[PDB]
Ligand binder design. Structure first.
Ligand SMILES: O=C(O)c1ccc[n+]([C@@H]2O[C@H](COP(=O)([O-])O)[C@@H](O)[C@H]2O)c1
Ligand SMILES: [Mg+2]
Ligand SMILES: [Mg+2]
Lengths: 189, 189
């Protein structure tokens, strides 16, 4: 069974925290590759001006085009939302029976796991990987592999606020992506 | 009074943690510049496999060129050995009495300020800026400015360890600095 890591999120926008995490785990547990899985736009969000899935995908290709081992997984975008990880992993496990999936999660998300949908049944479908700062320890009743990393506390939401507020975004996300964001007016048009 | 930031460290090697913090604080508190204050090495350690003050400055030069607002301060390097921040700031407070420096530190260090040599006298020479990830609160007995930043937990010590064990260093520090390290064979000596 080949080992593949998957990092899910809105990727609105994708950033160095996503890349760093992927790289870190890729090497730490020696994975064949890491797939970036964008989730579907959940209901009741089109009430303001929201980034289309199309742009999130373009920014995601910009961010990962330089890595052969980083791919985009459209499984969740191929269906309606919200995107429950359990439903998703159930389809990916059926599509790739020879793969052991490692679902990568940021240390700050670990506590929220008991609230995920069918998380216990989801535990049979994959192996969770919680990422944490060197020396810190993730707490959870669930079996989870930990990978210590120079964790980068950047997120898509903070980047959205920064752009809306004409704040700095230096070092926060790939250059080819900030270009795409300004050229197209995202979060600050 | 012009506001100036100071970031101290071995810068052995300088990395993205340093640059991210500088830019974040430079903006958050509207500073005119940020100065990188490298530590002087103990006199008796200039062989085995320890980087020279020489190799450190060139690396730091690489990491800061393209930033007009980032410059190197050599005040501590003008002494035969390591000297306390209090002694260094007291000297700078005098050479530039028209400046109110902002000594910047990682949030995880704030806890130990009480053990700093002359911490008390020092607190009246500079204004401390504790850096913190969003959410995390900075617990301290002192009247310190806190700036919320998407913290990057990379350190020189973690990097020196990565190169020694041929591990990945991606996204952790500038390419110009990485090129220099591998070519001159530092750490991986
Ligand atoms: O399955 C769930 O009920 C569930 C609830 C919250 C978050 N997640 C997972 O968390 C991943 C990244 O975090 P987030 O907050 O963008 O959803 C996302 O891709 C989902 O797979 C999953
Ligand atoms: Mg700016
Ligand atoms: Mg590698």
């Amino acid at each position: 069974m080949r080992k593949i890591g998957i990092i899910g999120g809105t990727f609105d926008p994708p950033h160095y925290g996503h890349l760093l995490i992927a790289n870190e785990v890729y090497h730490a547990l020696n994975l064949e590759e890491v797939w970036f899985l964008p989730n579907q736009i959940p209901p009741h969000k089109q009430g303001r001006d929201i980034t289309s899935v199309e742009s999130r995908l373009q920014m995601l290709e910009l961010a990962t085009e330089a890595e052969e081992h980083f791919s985009i997984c459209l499984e969740e975008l191929s269906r309606k939302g919200p995107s429950y990880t359990y439903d998703t992993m159930l389809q990916l496990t059926k599509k790739y029976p020879d793969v052991q999936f490692h679902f990568i999660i940021g240390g700050d998300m670990v506590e929220y796991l008991p609230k995920w949908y069918n998380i216990e049944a989801l535990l049979d479908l994959v192996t969770f990987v919680g990422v944490a700062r060197p020396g810190y320890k993730l707490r959870t009743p669930y079996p989870i592999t930990t990978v210590e990393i120079p964790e980068f506390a950047v997120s898509s939401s903070l980047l959205r606020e920064r752009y809306k507020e004409k704040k700095t975004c230096k070092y926060l996300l790939p250059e080819k992506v900030q270009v795409y964001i300004e050229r197209n007016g995202l979060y600050e048009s």
